[PDB]
Write a protein that binds this ligand. Structure first.
Ligand SMILES: CN(Cc1cnc2nc(N)nc(N)c2n1)c1ccc(C(=O)N[C@@H](CCC(=O)O)C(=O)O)cc1
Length: 159
């Protein structure tokens, strides 16, 4: 099935090719933990932000333009993206905003990071009626020396 994993700031602002706009260390850790050994689908920008292949995962870049790195898979359509995933049990969609929007309706799970931070940006995570999902895990964390904002991890399953 397909899952989306995203970092969200107040009002759902995301940094589309960034996360919940920023790059909280604790969040990147959670992100690795939950995407390792699974294929990850991302748009060009996010790839660019990342700058290298994410190790331990099959990197699939969804983009209309030709690739520039033979170490990852370049695809030009959601159909191709999925096929390249083969028959794994879970596909992780990592953003940005446009890719979230194309995959959200097909998704069955959401791995979210709620960061208590006001940030301005024009991009937000797509809307999802909270009444259609079910929270199965939550873990709140206060701001620390490493993470300047508090954040809360949450996993939801489509009901
Ligand atoms: C820009 N970006 C996209 C990004 C960032 N945070 C996210 N955070 C969440 N929760 N969800 C996303 N989809 C997400 N995407 C990045 C940037 C760096 C790395 C990265 O280096 N992660 C290493 C983790 C290494 C480390 O802990 O620094 C990895 O092995 O996954 C991943 C995604």
């Amino acid at each position: 099935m397909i899952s989306l994993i995203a970092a969200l700031a107040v009002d759902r602002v995301i940094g589309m090719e960034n996360a919940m706009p920023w790059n909280l260390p604790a969040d990147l850790a959670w992100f690795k933990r939950n995407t390792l050994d699974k294929p990850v689908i991302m748009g060009r920008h996010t790839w660019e932000s990342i700058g290298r292949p994410l190790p331990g995962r099959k990197n699939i870049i969804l983009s209309s333009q030709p690739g520039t790195d033979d170490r990852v898979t370049w695809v030009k359509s959601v159909d191709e993206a999925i096929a390249a995933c083969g028959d794994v049990p879970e596909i992780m969609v990592i953003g940005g905003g446009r890719v979230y929007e194309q995959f959200l309706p097909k998704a069955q799970k959401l791995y979210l990071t709620h960061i208590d931070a006001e940030v301005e940006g024009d991009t937000h995570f797509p809307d999802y009626e909270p009444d259609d999902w079910e929270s199965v895990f939550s873990e709140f964390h206060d701001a620390d020396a490493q993470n300047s904002h508090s954040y809360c991890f949450e996993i939801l399953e489509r009901r």
